[PDB]
């Protein structure tokens, strides 16, 4: 069917930067789907980070993050990147990935399983 | 809609129940594309109900999205024992998606 | 096809209202079929008129045209019958050539029917915000 | 809202084709936002233009207008580049007054979006049979 | 800067009312940014439009212009929807030259913002008494 | 896309200066978007104007045009406000046809952006030596 899994990253990184989150898509392609990143602080609620869309043409970067994260995609091997430059203050989360579906349809519909990245 | 909020109610298995999602600044509208997220307690999420009326293929028929009053509602008709989870809400305020706190359905 | 009672469902801002439209014949002067809500008041009816147009010596293209008219009533203090305060209109015109297949026309129809549910269109029609 | 790629799904006679539209700015002369398919050929793009119009001293009503343009290409024997044989158009215009609530406008929008899936409309548009 | 929800506080005759204004895009025809109150009725919105104007071959000066429009609604006996009885306007135009520093412009802005709280101005605007 | 504050970095003869440009709207008469440095003096601003041009009945090609204008100020003995002594200009015009794909256009853009760092160009622009 369609199963997502994120596993790349999750190290005890010093507050300097230079890590990479990555997930592999199985049941679909990035030609007509976009991917979200959300951020559950270890006791708080969820928080949306950033988003590339289908084909990689509109990228957003919610304004606690813009400038020090980069999200991209690589259509070969069907993987989705998340490359930062700094891990400043909290940045501790099970980082999930969401698959924004079709445009009149549901926008957080088939999720990942999360990786714990502690600073 | 910079922050959003909802309650933590519960119900019996033997009748319906609703879940509101109140935007803090003003009212929810159609532009606030409200869709719901279901979290089973293995922190295994799932998409539940789309923006206008839509459901994810695989979500059962006892689920309906609404705009009851000034709050995005969530009507579960005859809530059985398998959807004993927490439900998340979402709004697009024009700049970034905003998720709310849970609702511990038991 | 044959005119029949079109009972459209899941309509509105929330998505729970229904609208049943009864057919009221085809105008012979211009070939415009009409349907209206059974509200029993001839000025307070939500009506939909659909008409397809054959080619002439001045157009040479098929032209489909759909109009939706929704009036809003209000009761008054000074009279016992409600009047029409304002009306909401919608006008769709498809223009196809003399060589078009039905897959292209179904693509246009389903493209419009799926594009009227986009966040861009439900923000530009409901809240009247320009695309910016 | 804001212009962004609109990836419409379940389109066609069968219901399996998708159409991804990338935004291409807003025309400053008349306030018309444009979106088009990434087909990389400037004459063979399926395009959608949406524009809302403020009231003037000659209209005094809000006017929303959506245009859809779909050209069909064909290769030729006599040239190496495809040309436009024919085009399919669609033009929707909503006209609302200065006192209309958003429930009425959402009723009109969802009425049209549900009425473009009726058997009357899929028989009058696809097969071109009069009612 | 970027358009954002301007939530002005301590407004009114007493000084306790607040006014939250949501942005509604920038008009591409004339470069006029708009903000309005979230009152959800398109005729009963308190709105503020701000626009700065570049120099041309006919003005050769920078021109900042701010408009405030506040309509007042009233319910009616004879109709179910409220209408606009009257409107209050405000129009501010700053005109700066091509050689002005920012200290002079901030002096003009803060001079006007502190002069709209003088007893002369709160007696000439509120009670409409001429200065005498 | 949307106009935003373009903060260009690693600029100059040494490579350490930065330049932040704030957007100042789009001219409706000719469709020319402008950006300028926040120097707060309307004659001493480093400015960049970018505009893409649609095809007409006289050009039938897409035309992208970028202008960079950098004035140099000097204080004076005889006046208290600085004036413009001289200005440095740059004018780039891309001309693409109606059938060009985006790979060709990205090849032209990145070819120019990598060719403005060659020893030939940094010897012909900086030191003004002919090739």
XYZ file of C-alpha atoms in Angstrom:
751
model
C 0.000 0.000 0.000
C 1.709 3.153 1.279
C 4.016 3.216 4.316
C 6.329 6.074 5.271
C 9.286 5.785 7.630
C 11.754 8.410 8.855
C 15.005 7.132 10.359
C 17.923 9.375 9.316
C 19.171 11.544 12.168
C 18.634 11.505 15.894
C 22.104 12.093 17.281
C 23.109 13.993 20.415
C 24.263 16.998 18.418
C 26.090 19.906 20.060
C 24.520 23.379 19.601
C 26.468 24.134 16.406
C 24.347 22.695 13.581
C 25.137 20.289 10.732
C 22.666 17.398 10.834
C 20.318 15.873 8.242
C 16.823 14.447 8.641
C 15.618 12.204 5.827
C 12.638 9.960 5.112
C 11.903 7.472 2.332
C 8.579 7.374 0.489
C 7.209 4.032 -0.695
C 3.646 4.034 -2.016
C 3.665 7.272 -4.014
C 5.888 9.773 -5.826
C 6.817 13.423 -5.333
C 5.299 14.448 -8.678
C 1.888 15.299 -7.184
C 2.424 15.305 -3.403
C 4.023 17.647 -0.881
C 5.606 16.865 2.487
C 5.224 18.624 5.841
C 7.461 18.628 8.913
C 5.936 18.946 12.381
C 7.690 19.246 15.723
C 6.454 17.806 19.037
C 8.371 19.374 21.914
C 8.849 16.699 24.640
C 5.840 17.850 26.692
C 4.239 20.620 24.598
C 1.885 20.374 21.646
C 2.788 19.908 18.013
C 4.313 22.693 15.932
C 4.588 23.012 12.160
C 8.075 23.674 10.771
C 8.215 23.882 6.970
C 6.837 22.436 3.734
C 7.820 21.831 0.158
C 4.985 21.219 -2.261
C 4.467 18.922 -5.253
C 7.436 19.347 -7.579
C 9.242 21.711 -5.199
C 8.118 25.205 -6.184
C 6.591 26.798 -3.048
C 8.453 26.539 0.271
C 7.207 28.256 3.423
C 9.421 28.097 6.593
C 7.210 29.184 9.565
C 8.761 32.142 11.353
C 10.658 30.552 14.178
C 12.822 28.646 11.698
C 13.304 30.672 8.475
C 17.001 31.027 7.640
C 18.517 28.131 9.581
C 16.640 25.091 8.227
C 16.563 23.926 4.615
C 14.095 21.394 3.216
C 14.607 19.888 -0.232
C 13.708 16.775 -2.167
C 15.565 14.364 -4.418
C 13.329 12.695 -7.001
C 15.898 9.962 -7.561
C 15.397 7.201 -4.922
C 12.283 9.085 -3.585
C 13.722 10.765 -0.488
C 12.940 13.991 1.350
C 15.669 16.146 2.895
C 15.859 18.401 5.949
C 19.231 20.133 6.369
C 19.893 22.752 9.034
C 22.713 25.093 10.068
C 22.013 25.621 13.790
C 20.457 23.870 16.805
C 20.027 26.836 19.108
C 17.828 26.457 22.193
C 15.265 23.624 22.390
C 15.058 21.745 19.001
C 14.089 18.466 20.731
C 11.355 16.525 18.994
C 10.075 13.407 17.415
C 10.102 14.920 13.921
C 7.212 13.552 11.844
C 6.454 13.826 8.124
C 2.954 14.078 6.767
C 2.334 13.850 2.943
C 0.082 16.776 2.040
C -2.375 15.001 -0.240
C -4.365 16.313 -3.166
C -5.523 19.903 -3.148
C -9.208 19.626 -2.300
C -8.430 16.630 -0.096
C -6.877 16.078 3.327
C -3.548 17.800 4.012
C -2.028 15.697 6.848
C -3.189 12.214 5.925
C -0.425 9.550 5.907
C 2.186 10.128 8.586
C 5.623 8.899 9.566
C 6.732 7.506 12.908
C 9.215 10.094 14.179
C 12.872 10.375 15.160
C 14.033 11.802 18.491
C 16.685 14.488 17.918
C 18.098 15.890 21.173
C 20.408 18.898 21.358
C -5.652 32.671 14.380
C -2.217 32.680 15.993
C -3.258 30.125 18.663
C -6.072 27.576 18.790
C -7.628 25.613 21.624
C -9.976 22.759 22.500
C -11.106 20.717 25.492
C -10.260 17.255 26.887
C -13.719 15.704 27.287
C -14.791 12.046 27.191
C -17.901 9.999 26.495
C -19.550 6.607 26.810
C -19.425 4.085 23.945
C -23.205 4.122 23.607
C -24.009 7.377 21.794
C -22.634 10.286 19.715
C -20.186 13.003 20.819
C -18.827 16.239 19.304
C -15.429 17.960 19.434
C -15.030 21.698 18.930
C -11.948 23.574 17.692
C -12.187 27.241 18.668
C -9.894 29.796 17.074
C -8.777 32.297 19.691
C -8.927 35.451 17.528
C -12.388 35.776 16.020
C -14.154 32.851 14.367
C -13.144 29.999 12.106
C -13.949 30.432 8.422
C -13.591 28.477 5.194
C -10.116 29.969 4.696
C -9.060 28.295 7.930
C -8.685 24.902 6.251
C -9.634 22.748 9.237
C -8.647 19.074 9.172
C -8.291 16.529 11.964
C -5.474 14.194 13.045
C -5.997 11.000 15.101
C -3.204 9.734 17.356
C -3.289 6.123 18.589
C -1.156 5.903 21.786
C 1.854 4.341 20.053
C 2.199 7.931 18.733
C 1.029 6.499 15.395
C -0.832 9.366 13.742
C -3.472 9.168 11.004
C -5.371 11.681 8.893
C -9.065 11.726 9.716
C -11.312 14.310 7.963
C -10.432 16.862 5.282
C -11.144 20.538 4.961
C -14.721 20.847 3.700
C -16.351 17.433 4.180
C -13.739 15.001 2.913
C -12.524 11.821 4.584
C -9.283 9.927 4.053
C -10.009 6.632 2.195
C -9.995 4.117 5.030
C -11.649 6.316 7.667
C -15.027 4.781 8.657
C -18.410 6.334 7.959
C -19.078 7.439 11.563
C -17.069 10.636 11.090
C -18.173 14.043 9.806
C -16.575 17.483 9.687
C -18.595 20.616 10.303
C -18.671 24.375 10.837
C -21.229 24.370 13.680
C -21.524 27.971 14.844
C -18.137 29.691 14.975
C -16.140 26.525 15.724
C -14.867 23.692 13.554
C -16.721 20.658 14.884
C -16.121 16.899 14.753
C -19.159 14.624 15.092
C -18.486 10.943 15.796
C -21.781 9.065 15.452
C -21.852 6.084 17.798
C -18.286 6.169 19.097
C -17.076 2.592 19.490
C -14.114 1.403 21.545
C -11.405 1.377 18.858
C -11.160 5.172 18.427
C -10.125 5.697 22.063
C -7.412 8.184 21.189
C -6.548 11.887 21.136
C -7.672 14.133 18.280
C -5.709 17.093 16.915
C -6.956 20.183 15.080
C -5.353 22.427 12.469
C -5.861 25.925 11.071
C -4.131 27.935 8.343
C -4.019 31.552 9.542
C -2.589 32.847 6.257
C 1.069 32.301 7.160
C 1.597 29.011 9.026
C -0.363 25.968 10.161
C -1.375 26.043 13.831
C -2.059 22.839 15.750
C -3.885 22.701 19.072
C -3.793 20.652 22.233
C -5.294 17.196 22.366
C -8.676 15.824 23.397
C -8.354 12.623 25.437
C -11.307 10.543 24.266
C -11.901 7.639 26.645
C -30.635 14.160 -21.063
C -34.185 14.241 -19.719
C -35.026 16.950 -17.194
C -35.478 15.569 -13.688
C -35.425 16.663 -10.059
C -31.770 17.362 -9.268
C -31.290 16.900 -5.514
C -27.826 18.284 -4.794
C -26.357 17.360 -1.426
C -23.607 18.513 0.976
C -23.842 22.217 0.147
C -22.836 25.204 2.230
C -20.163 26.702 4.437
C -20.373 23.701 6.778
C -21.424 21.099 4.211
C -24.794 19.814 5.445
C -27.483 21.679 3.482
C -29.292 20.127 0.526
C -31.031 21.742 -2.435
C -33.743 19.997 -4.450
C -34.502 21.509 -7.864
C -37.644 20.687 -9.857
C -37.654 21.108 -13.647
C -39.882 23.782 -15.172
C -39.747 23.084 -18.895
C -37.588 24.309 -21.759
C -38.071 27.804 -23.189
C -38.817 27.371 -26.927
C -37.663 30.879 -27.878
C -33.998 30.342 -26.981
C -33.596 26.710 -25.858
C -32.905 27.414 -22.176
C -33.904 24.712 -19.698
C -34.873 25.892 -16.216
C -34.936 24.328 -12.756
C -35.988 25.905 -9.478
C -36.422 25.212 -5.781
C -39.912 24.250 -4.624
C -40.353 27.289 -2.381
C -43.838 28.005 -3.793
C -43.207 31.780 -4.033
C -42.435 32.844 -7.644
C -39.941 35.565 -6.634
C -38.081 33.713 -3.866
C -36.930 30.683 -5.871
C -33.315 29.637 -6.252
C -33.072 28.837 -9.948
C -30.604 27.251 -12.378
C -30.814 27.647 -16.166
C -28.729 25.492 -18.520
C -28.513 25.793 -22.309
C -26.261 24.392 -25.036
C -25.907 26.345 -28.282
C -25.418 24.872 -31.789
C -23.042 26.572 -34.272
C -24.230 29.388 -36.510
C -22.714 31.418 -39.337
C -21.358 33.829 -36.688
C -19.981 31.598 -33.895
C -18.945 28.174 -35.416
C -18.343 26.777 -31.897
C -20.459 24.870 -29.393
C -21.375 27.021 -26.394
C -22.641 25.616 -23.082
C -23.970 28.150 -20.578
C -25.139 27.670 -16.981
C -26.649 30.405 -14.804
C -27.385 30.217 -11.076
C -29.570 32.857 -9.413
C -30.160 32.942 -5.650
C -32.368 35.696 -4.171
C -32.506 36.538 -0.471
C -35.827 37.443 1.133
C -36.535 39.670 4.116
C -39.750 40.316 5.988
C -40.791 43.931 6.437
C -42.545 46.173 8.939
C -44.873 48.087 6.647
C -45.972 45.133 4.535
C -46.979 41.517 5.112
C -45.188 39.928 2.156
C -41.402 39.522 1.922
C -39.463 41.200 -0.873
C -36.138 40.589 -2.599
C -33.321 42.517 -0.931
C -30.409 41.224 -3.015
C -29.452 38.416 -5.375
C -26.328 36.325 -5.909
C -25.401 35.329 -9.455
C -23.157 32.789 -11.137
C -22.502 32.445 -14.869
C -20.419 29.673 -16.452
C -19.736 29.497 -20.189
C -17.887 26.641 -21.885
C -16.767 27.199 -25.483
C -15.678 24.121 -27.433
C -14.611 23.764 -31.043
C -15.950 21.561 -33.818
C -13.156 18.957 -33.463
C -12.964 18.397 -29.694
C -13.207 14.908 -28.218
C -15.190 14.156 -25.066
C -12.088 13.436 -22.961
C -10.968 17.066 -23.309
C -14.427 18.350 -22.374
C -14.650 16.038 -19.362
C -11.167 17.230 -18.379
C -12.357 20.861 -18.484
C -15.542 20.064 -16.527
C -13.818 18.026 -13.814
C -10.955 20.550 -13.662
C -13.451 23.315 -12.881
C -15.410 21.119 -10.448
C -12.220 20.236 -8.561
C -10.833 23.783 -8.802
C -13.910 25.261 -7.106
C -12.800 23.404 -3.934
C -9.209 24.686 -3.815
C -8.073 26.900 -0.906
C -7.382 29.665 -3.441
C -10.982 29.658 -4.658
C -12.596 29.203 -1.230
C -10.506 32.146 -0.044
C -11.226 34.316 -3.103
C -14.985 33.640 -3.260
C -15.943 33.373 0.413
C -13.633 35.943 2.022
C -13.006 37.979 -1.192
C -9.259 38.169 -0.767
C -7.222 38.712 -3.947
C -4.570 36.134 -4.738
C -1.437 37.606 -3.169
C -5.038 33.620 0.020
C -1.671 33.407 -1.645
C -0.549 31.898 -4.915
C 0.906 28.417 -4.592
C 0.981 25.231 -6.616
C -2.482 23.763 -6.779
C -2.250 20.003 -7.300
C -5.771 18.995 -8.307
C -6.506 15.279 -8.209
C -9.038 12.765 -9.598
C -9.667 14.569 -12.887
C -10.921 13.185 -16.173
C -13.476 10.963 -17.840
C -12.328 8.004 -15.727
C -11.179 9.955 -12.670
C -7.475 9.127 -12.317
C -5.533 12.006 -13.896
C -3.916 14.750 -11.829
C -2.997 18.318 -12.739
C -0.326 20.304 -10.899
C -0.403 24.075 -11.434
C 2.505 26.369 -10.535
C 1.862 30.059 -9.820
C 3.262 32.646 -12.225
C 2.712 35.949 -10.452
C -0.052 38.544 -10.447
C -0.489 40.909 -13.399
C -0.244 44.471 -12.001
C -2.198 46.060 -14.864
C -5.507 44.340 -14.079
C -5.011 42.245 -10.920
C -5.266 38.816 -12.566
C -3.392 35.967 -10.891
C -2.164 33.185 -13.171
C -1.274 29.520 -12.721
C -0.077 27.050 -15.331
C 1.036 23.466 -15.826
C 4.780 22.818 -15.773
C 4.944 21.586 -19.367
C 7.964 23.804 -20.143
C 6.570 24.897 -23.543
C 5.069 28.432 -23.374
C 2.268 27.693 -25.872
C 1.248 24.222 -24.663
C 0.432 25.089 -21.042
C -2.920 24.450 -19.409
C -3.551 27.682 -17.529
C -5.993 29.066 -14.955
C -6.437 32.787 -14.246
C -8.383 34.026 -11.211
C -9.220 37.639 -10.348
C -11.531 39.395 -7.892
C -12.749 42.900 -8.730
C -13.457 45.727 -6.234
C -16.468 48.042 -6.760
C -16.211 51.132 -8.935
C -18.506 54.031 -9.798
C -19.898 51.893 -12.654
C -20.370 48.395 -11.165
C -20.925 48.724 -7.333
C -20.704 44.913 -6.959
C -17.902 42.474 -6.205
C -16.989 40.390 -9.255
C -14.989 37.149 -9.088
C -13.828 35.716 -12.414
C -12.061 32.427 -13.192
C -10.813 31.393 -16.636
C -9.501 27.972 -17.664
C -7.659 27.532 -20.967
C -6.540 24.121 -22.241
C -4.725 23.888 -25.604
C -4.203 20.645 -27.505
C -0.925 20.033 -29.322
C -0.232 17.945 -32.407
C 3.035 16.990 -34.043
C 3.395 17.723 -37.740
C 5.025 16.301 -40.853
C 6.558 19.434 -42.330
C 7.890 20.871 -39.080
C 9.668 19.576 -35.984
C 7.805 21.590 -33.349
C 4.183 20.951 -32.339
C 1.553 23.640 -32.818
C -1.806 24.444 -31.243
C -4.666 22.815 -33.138
C -7.544 23.859 -30.875
C -8.268 25.157 -27.387
C -10.961 24.488 -24.795
C -12.193 27.388 -22.675
C -14.116 27.860 -19.451
C -15.243 31.161 -17.932
C -16.950 31.511 -14.541
C -18.137 34.856 -13.176
C -19.616 35.338 -9.706
C -21.352 38.657 -9.010
C -22.090 39.470 -5.370
C -23.594 42.572 -3.814
C -22.278 44.879 -1.114
C -24.414 43.301 1.652
C -23.925 39.558 1.100
C -22.777 37.298 3.925
C -20.234 34.521 3.416
C -22.781 31.724 3.935
C -24.637 32.783 0.773
C -21.400 32.930 -1.223
C -20.274 29.523 0.041
C -23.737 28.212 -0.860
C -23.319 29.503 -4.434
C -19.782 28.081 -4.726
C -20.642 24.643 -3.344
C -23.892 24.589 -5.352
C -21.904 25.077 -8.559
C -19.208 22.596 -7.490
C -21.840 19.943 -6.742
C -23.922 20.827 -9.815
C -20.979 20.228 -12.164
C -21.211 16.526 -11.179
C -24.925 16.032 -11.896
C -26.028 13.640 -14.673
C -27.626 16.623 -16.437
C -24.319 18.487 -16.604
C -22.151 15.456 -17.419
C -24.580 14.692 -20.241
C -24.771 18.293 -21.497
C -21.019 19.015 -21.365
C -19.488 15.669 -22.334
C -21.993 14.365 -24.895
C -23.486 17.809 -25.779
C -27.089 16.707 -25.531
C -29.646 19.445 -24.809
C -31.823 18.984 -21.751
C 7.427 46.026 6.117
C 5.407 42.822 5.876
C 1.646 43.103 6.323
C 0.470 41.658 9.630
C -2.441 41.821 12.052
C -2.208 45.251 13.679
C -3.900 45.031 17.090
C -4.197 48.629 18.271
C -4.992 49.093 21.944
C -6.336 51.771 24.327
C -8.676 53.430 21.828
C -11.771 55.500 22.458
C -13.282 58.299 24.492
C -12.498 56.421 27.715
C -9.418 54.549 26.498
C -10.306 50.861 26.876
C -11.432 49.627 23.447
C -9.156 47.638 21.146
C -9.200 47.226 17.374
C -7.630 44.254 15.596
C -7.008 44.696 11.864
C -6.277 41.788 9.512
C -4.379 42.404 6.262
C -6.208 41.912 2.968
C -3.472 42.110 0.355
C -1.991 44.895 -1.747
C -3.906 46.305 -4.721
C -1.650 45.866 -7.791
C -3.313 48.654 -9.793
C -2.222 51.490 -7.492
C -0.052 49.980 -4.730
C -2.496 50.507 -1.852
C -2.273 48.069 1.054
C -5.500 47.400 2.946
C -6.384 46.210 6.444
C -9.815 45.683 7.955
C -11.604 44.561 11.097
C -12.723 40.932 11.219
C -16.432 41.747 11.430
C -17.294 39.212 8.696
C -19.742 41.592 6.950
C -18.166 43.178 3.823
C -19.945 46.537 4.254
C -19.572 46.964 8.027
C -15.775 46.742 8.261
C -13.578 49.434 9.755
C -10.745 49.677 7.248
C -7.333 51.341 6.936
C -5.485 51.770 3.627
C -1.822 52.819 3.505
C 0.240 53.574 0.394
C 3.616 55.170 -0.324
C 4.183 56.775 -3.726
C 7.484 56.889 -5.674
C 8.462 60.049 -7.613
C 7.289 60.608 -11.171
C 7.938 63.216 -13.853
C 5.054 65.253 -12.371
C 5.532 65.074 -8.574
C 9.301 64.511 -7.807
C 8.481 63.976 -4.100
C 7.731 60.942 -1.953
C 4.082 60.835 -0.888
C 2.769 58.693 1.980
C -1.012 58.465 2.318
C -3.145 56.818 5.014
C -6.943 56.564 4.928
C -9.224 55.417 7.748
C -12.876 54.590 7.050
C -15.332 53.696 9.822
C -18.969 52.924 8.913
C -21.799 52.793 11.440
C -24.507 50.153 11.101
C -28.133 50.267 12.193
C -30.773 47.565 12.229
C -34.056 48.336 10.511
C -37.762 47.599 10.828
C -38.613 46.741 7.241
C -35.555 44.608 6.539
C -33.547 41.938 8.345
C -30.049 43.068 7.367
C -28.357 46.201 8.737
C -27.327 49.003 6.401
C -24.762 51.802 6.505
C -26.231 54.991 7.955
C -23.090 57.144 7.942
C -19.314 56.898 7.716
C -16.416 58.682 9.403
C -13.301 59.408 7.357
C -9.692 60.337 8.014
C -7.041 61.160 5.413
C -3.372 61.827 6.202
C -0.833 62.756 3.528
C 2.887 63.190 4.179
C 4.947 64.834 1.427
C 8.727 64.531 1.706
C 11.453 65.692 -0.642
C 14.262 63.783 -2.318
C 16.910 64.932 0.207
C 15.188 64.414 3.570
C 16.832 62.368 6.315
C 14.890 59.930 8.488
C 15.222 62.052 11.641
C 13.107 64.802 10.055
C 10.464 62.298 8.949
C 10.343 60.661 12.381
C 10.041 64.157 13.870
C 7.017 64.868 11.641
C 5.409 61.493 12.439
C 5.907 61.719 16.205
C 4.896 65.402 16.172
C 1.566 64.462 14.594
C 1.122 61.433 16.876
C 1.731 63.582 19.966
C -0.296 66.512 18.598
C -3.402 64.347 18.153
C -3.509 64.074 21.981
C -3.339 67.802 22.771
C -6.301 69.524 24.476
C -6.640 71.730 21.383
C -7.119 68.726 19.107
C -9.316 66.720 21.494
C -11.499 69.815 21.813
C -11.559 70.566 18.070
C -12.212 66.985 16.903
C -14.477 65.613 19.636
C -16.555 68.675 20.552
C -15.979 70.553 17.234
C -15.125 73.860 18.844
C -12.996 76.250 16.765
C -9.745 77.417 18.305
C -10.713 80.674 20.005
C 7.581 35.105 -6.714
C 6.594 37.381 -3.841
C 8.784 40.414 -3.197
C 10.862 40.058 -0.041
C 13.988 41.432 1.604
C 16.892 40.032 -0.415
C 19.944 39.923 1.867
C 22.866 39.177 -0.441
C 26.066 38.076 1.264
C 29.813 37.789 0.535
C 30.031 40.804 -1.773
C 33.020 42.950 -2.631
C 36.664 42.958 -3.617
C 37.549 40.982 -0.477
C 34.263 39.104 -0.092
C 32.929 40.159 3.319
C 30.364 42.917 2.710
C 26.623 42.266 2.752
C 23.766 44.138 1.096
C 20.181 43.979 2.350
C 17.513 45.146 -0.106
C 13.943 45.981 0.932
C 11.124 45.786 -1.628
C 9.381 49.001 -2.660
C 6.397 47.825 -4.679
C 5.757 47.179 -8.358
C 5.311 50.081 -10.784
C 1.880 49.617 -12.435
C 2.751 51.667 -15.530
C 5.411 49.275 -16.846
C 5.538 46.265 -14.493
C 8.966 46.970 -12.985
C 9.579 45.705 -9.455
C 12.025 47.710 -7.347
C 14.242 46.975 -4.351
C 16.590 49.321 -2.528
C 19.008 49.536 0.378
C 17.633 50.906 3.645
C 19.924 53.940 3.708
C 17.019 56.301 4.505
C 18.209 58.964 2.017
C 16.151 58.871 -1.229
C 19.097 59.801 -3.485
C 21.810 57.638 -1.896
C 20.112 54.243 -2.232
C 21.622 51.285 -4.045
C 18.693 49.968 -6.059
C 17.814 46.932 -8.186
C 14.873 46.830 -10.614
C 13.680 43.562 -12.170
C 10.959 43.140 -14.800
C 9.776 40.335 -17.079
C 7.997 41.250 -20.316
C 5.176 39.276 -22.006
C 5.084 38.946 -25.825
C 3.427 41.581 -27.983
C 2.662 41.958 -31.681
C 6.134 43.521 -32.095
C 8.485 41.329 -30.010
C 6.991 37.750 -29.774
C 9.682 36.779 -27.219
C 9.882 36.796 -23.432
C 12.248 39.490 -22.159
C 13.699 39.547 -18.633
C 15.546 42.714 -17.625
C 17.522 43.505 -14.462
C 19.064 46.891 -13.654
C 21.469 47.691 -10.813
C 22.202 51.309 -9.880
C 24.790 52.254 -7.249
C 25.398 55.952 -6.473
C 28.401 57.242 -4.541
C 27.968 60.093 -2.071
C 30.460 62.727 -0.971
C 30.226 65.348 1.738
C 30.943 68.930 0.741
C 32.464 72.104 2.151
C 29.865 74.650 1.100
C 26.810 72.579 1.978
C 25.707 70.306 4.813
C 24.031 67.577 2.762
C 25.921 65.061 0.605
C 25.332 64.918 -3.138
C 25.752 62.284 -5.840
C 29.179 62.484 -7.466
C 28.901 59.481 -9.791
C 26.877 56.323 -10.349
C 27.705 52.776 -11.423
C 25.234 50.935 -13.642
C 24.547 47.360 -14.676
C 21.951 46.175 -17.191
C 21.187 42.518 -17.949
C 18.647 41.451 -20.571
C 17.637 37.843 -21.218
C 15.653 37.143 -24.394
C 13.951 33.752 -24.633
C 11.683 32.339 -27.308
C 8.177 30.918 -27.092
C 9.364 27.272 -27.153
C 12.236 27.248 -24.642
C 12.297 24.772 -21.764
C 13.388 25.742 -18.256
C 16.608 23.696 -18.398
C 17.957 25.950 -21.164
C 17.031 29.091 -19.226
C 18.607 27.777 -16.023
C 21.693 26.902 -18.081
C 21.899 30.504 -19.342
C 21.362 31.950 -15.845
C 23.902 29.708 -14.114
C 26.347 30.148 -17.018
C 26.253 33.916 -16.511
C 26.413 33.600 -12.709
C 29.474 31.342 -12.953
C 31.037 33.392 -15.766
C 30.971 36.581 -13.681
C 33.561 34.900 -11.400
C 36.065 33.914 -14.102
C 39.560 35.476 -14.124
C 38.740 36.959 -17.542
C 35.726 38.827 -16.177
C 37.320 39.866 -12.870
C 40.228 41.234 -14.898
C 38.035 42.962 -17.501
C 35.566 44.530 -15.040
C 37.778 45.385 -12.063
C 41.041 46.383 -13.765
C 39.466 47.216 -17.186
C 42.004 45.298 -19.219
C 40.868 44.125 -22.668
C 41.093 40.415 -23.369
